[PDB]
């Protein structure tokens, strides 16, 4: 009674037969903002099922020489659904998340992925290599949407911080002998009770193969990874025209 899970939120439902468990981030469940903590006087709209539901972004292919990918939140859902219109039409935003990563393979494949949630994953540059240039990353690479961006130097996570110590944040491991899902439930993390979804990204989702995928030819060489994510306890406030960026 642990390797099976049914995540039901809204009009969506994910079944799993080869789960590990559910991680709840920093031991806090997602919630709404108190009256003590709030400052804005406007009454926020709390749409409970039209945005709190599972969305499915795109697929990335785990090849042999794959290095890793990251997805910035909530940039993934600003052009997608009733969530991504309210985020455009409003100035503020506050939601938790339930991330779900799927990678199914046989009992003759092997490999491991680290699926980590790093708050405030600020991106660095190679400084031209020499270290002389104070270069900055482009908007394509800082906020890449739902198609994600691949890491060039995954040992340092493209920020100068090591992959080894990333298990101090939230994480699960997708070991193809043991599991094919990873469920992480994230609360809202910010110094502020509310912030804008289009300028500030609250956290990043790292997917890194620590162990390389291996199979003997004859098997299926195409092993996708699909990110599936639900907002939770979402709140919006400050209504004006729709702006994309």
Partner 1 sequence: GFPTELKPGTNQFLTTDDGVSAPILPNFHPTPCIHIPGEVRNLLELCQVETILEVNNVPTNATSLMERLRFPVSAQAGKGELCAVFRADPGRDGPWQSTMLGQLCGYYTQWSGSLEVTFMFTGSFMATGKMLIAYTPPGGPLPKDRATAMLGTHVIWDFGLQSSVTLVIPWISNTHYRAHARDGVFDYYTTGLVSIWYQTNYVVPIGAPNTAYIIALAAAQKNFTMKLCKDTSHILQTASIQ
Partner 2 sequence: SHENSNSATEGSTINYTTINYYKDSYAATAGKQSLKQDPDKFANPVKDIFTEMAAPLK
Partner 3 sequence: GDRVADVIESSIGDSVSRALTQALPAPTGQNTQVSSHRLDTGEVPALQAAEIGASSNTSDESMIETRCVLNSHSTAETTLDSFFSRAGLVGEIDLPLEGTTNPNGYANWDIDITGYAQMRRKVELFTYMRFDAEFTFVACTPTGQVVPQLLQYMFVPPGAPKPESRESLAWQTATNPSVFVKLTDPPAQVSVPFMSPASAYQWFYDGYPTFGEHKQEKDLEYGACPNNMMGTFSVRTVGSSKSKYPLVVRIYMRMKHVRAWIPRPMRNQNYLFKANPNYAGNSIKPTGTSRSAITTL
Binding site for partner 2 (CB under 8 A): 1-3, 20-27, 168, 170, 178, 185
How does DSSP classify residue 100? E
Applying CB under 8 A, the span of 55-63, 92-100, 172-180, 220-228 interacting with partner 3 comes to 172-180
State which residue, 61 or 126, has the beta carbon closest to partner 3. Answer: 126
Residues in 90-129 at the binding interface with partner 3, rule: CB under 8 A? 118-127, 129
In sequence order, the β-bridge partners of residue 55 are 229
From residue 48 to residue 87, the character string flagging contacts with partner 1 as x (rule: CB under 8 A) and all else as - is ------xxxxx--------x------------xx------
Please choose, from the candidates 99, 52, 98, 12, the residue with its C-alpha nearest in 3D space to the C-alpha of residue 236. Answer: 52
1 binds, options partner 2, partner 1, partner 3, none, Cβ within 5 to 8 A by partner type? partner 2
Please tell me whether residue 192 binds partner 3 under the rule CB under 8 A: yes
In sequence order, the β-bridge partners of residue 99 are 184, 229
Burial track 105-135 (b if 16+ CB lie within 10 A, e otherwise): beeebebbbbbbbbbebebeeeeeeeeeeee
Taking CB under 8 A as the criterion, the residue among 154, 185, 225, 227 binding partner 1 is 154
Please tell me whether residue 59 binds partner 3 under the rule CB under 8 A: no
State which residue, 19 or 123, has the beta carbon closest to partner 1. Answer: 19
How does DSSP classify residue 236? E
CB 225 within 8 A of CB 102: yes
Least CB distance from residue 59 to partner 3, whole Å? 22
Q: How far apart are CA 141 and CA 151, in angstroms?
A: 10
Least CB distance from residue 140 to partner 1, whole Å? 20
What number of chain residues touch partner 3 (CB under 8 A)?
A: 82
Query: For residue 84, which phi and psi values (nearest 5 degrees)?
Result: -75, -5
Q: In this structure, what is the dihedral angle of CA atoms 211, 121, 30, 17, given to the nearest 10 degrees?
A: -20
60 binds, options partner 2, partner 1, partner 3, none, Cβ within 5 to 8 A by partner type? none
Least CB distance from residue 180 to partner 1, whole Å? 7
Please choose, from the candidates 239, 240, 236, 238, the residue with its C-alpha nearest in 3D space to the C-alpha of residue 32. Answer: 236
| Lookup: tokens for 57 | 């972004």
Applying CB under 8 A, the span of 70-78, 120-128, 135-143, 237-245 interacting with partner 1 comes to 237-245
From residue 12 to residue 41, the character string flagging contacts with partner 1 as x (rule: CB under 8 A) and all else as - is xxxxxxx------xxxx-----x--x-xxx
């Amino acid at each position: 009674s642990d390797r099976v899970a049914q995540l039901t939120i809204g009009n969506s439902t994910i079944t799993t037969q080869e789960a590990a468990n559910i991680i709840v981030g920093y031991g806090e469940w997602p919630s709404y903002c108190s009256d003590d903590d709030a400052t804005a006087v406007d009454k926020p709209t709390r749409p409970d099922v039209s945005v709190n539901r599972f969305y499915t972004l795109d697929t990335k292919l785990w090849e042999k020489s794959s290095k890793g990918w990251y997805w910035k939140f909530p940039d993934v859902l600003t052009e997608t659904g009733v969530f991504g219109q309210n985020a455009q039409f409003h100035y503020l935003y506050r939601s938790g998340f339930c991330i779900h990563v799927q990678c199914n393979a046989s009992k003759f494949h092997q490999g491991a992925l680290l699926v980590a949630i790093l708050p405030e994953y600020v991106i660095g540059t190679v400084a031209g290599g020499t270290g002389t240039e104070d270069s900055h990353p482009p908007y394509k690479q800082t906020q890449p949407g739902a198609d994600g961006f691949e890491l060039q130097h995954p040992y340092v996570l493209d920020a100068g911080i090591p992959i080894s110590q990333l298990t101090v944040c939230h994480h699960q491991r997708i070991n193809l002998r043991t599991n094919n899902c990873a469920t992480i439930i994230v609360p809202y993390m910010n110094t502020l009770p509310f912030d804008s979804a289009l300028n500030h990204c609250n956290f990043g989702l790292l997917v890194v193969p620590i162990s390389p995928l291996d199979f003997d030819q004859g098997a299926t060489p195409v092993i996708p990874i699909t990110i599936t994510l639900a907002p939770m306890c979402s709140e919006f406030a400050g209504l004006r025209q729709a702006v994309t960026q």
